Design a protein around this ligand. Structure first.
Ligand SMILES: *[C@@H]1O[C@H](CO)[C@@H](O[C@@H]2O[C@H](CO)[C@@H](O)[C@H](O)[C@H]2NC(C)=O)[C@H](O)[C@H]1NC(C)=O
Ligand SMILES: *[C@@H]1O[C@H](CO)[C@@H](O[C@@H]2O[C@H](CO)[C@@H](O)[C@H](O)[C@H]2NC(C)=O)[C@H](O)[C@H]1NC(C)=O
Ligand SMILES: CC(=O)N[C@@H]1[C@@H](O)[C@H](O)[C@@H](CO)O[C@H]1O
Ligand SMILES: CC(=O)N[C@@H]1[C@@H](O)[C@H](O)[C@@H](CO)O[C@H]1O
Lengths: 48, 49, 48
């Protein structure tokens, strides 16, 4: 039901963030891509 | 995606080129058949034994 | 007296930060763990 990111050799699920991910191109370019929230720790830290 | 990452070429270099990579691979496997169809001289390593 | 972090193969110490470290779990689990203040390079940049 919920998406995560994890180290391939041992299941330890992590929150999908811009610390755990990087970007290239756009959503039209990649085969098999899906829709999901990418969180960012800087957001509550600015807002609070 | 991992394979390419294992040679320091980041995962997205596969995904931004995936059908091109599969065409290069399909072309290369095709050339193996034509090479092995043409001649026995490649298998000298076995026909010598 | 002070806690630093360094690469394994040549002593080149640094102040411990959330850029130098990653988090998992809590202080119960890790045999032989210690305490120190982790610096957060975002806080002076939010506050100033
Ligand atoms: C997928 O992971 C999420 C997050 O851990 C699970 O959702 C949580 O479920 C527990 C009960 O098991 C609740 O206490 C949490 O409040 C839920 N959190 C959220 C963000 O929804 C979810 O149960 C897992 N999905 C499946 C099918 O197991
Ligand atoms: C790290 O610091 C914590 C406090 O943040 C220490 O926790 C105390 O531990 C003793 C022994 O179990 C307890 O008597 C106290 O009640 C604890 N205090 C709190 C606030 O939890 C901890 O011992 C320190 N650990 C090390 C290895 O330095
Ligand atoms: C990401 C991907 O390849 N998805 C395909 C899907 O589009 C196709 O309809 C299905 C056929 O069973 O196989 C899978
Ligand atoms: C985490 C760990 O190994 N701690 C041990 C401690 O229990 C022991 O008393 C001390 C002296 O032998 O050496 C260290």
């Amino acid at each position: 039901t919920h998406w995560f990111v994890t180290q391939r050799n041992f299941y330890e699920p992590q929150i999908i963030t811009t610390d755990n991910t990087f970007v290239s191109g756009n959503c039209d370019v990649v085969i098999g891509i899906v829709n999901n929230t990418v969180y960012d720790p800087l957001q509550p830290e600015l807002d609070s | 995606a991992y394979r390419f990452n294992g040679i320091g070429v980041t995962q997205n270099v596969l995904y931004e080129n995936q059908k091109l990579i599969a065409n290069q691979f399909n072309s290369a496997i095709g050339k193996i058949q034509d090479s092995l169809s043409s001649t026995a001289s490649a298998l000298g390593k076995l026909q010598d034994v």
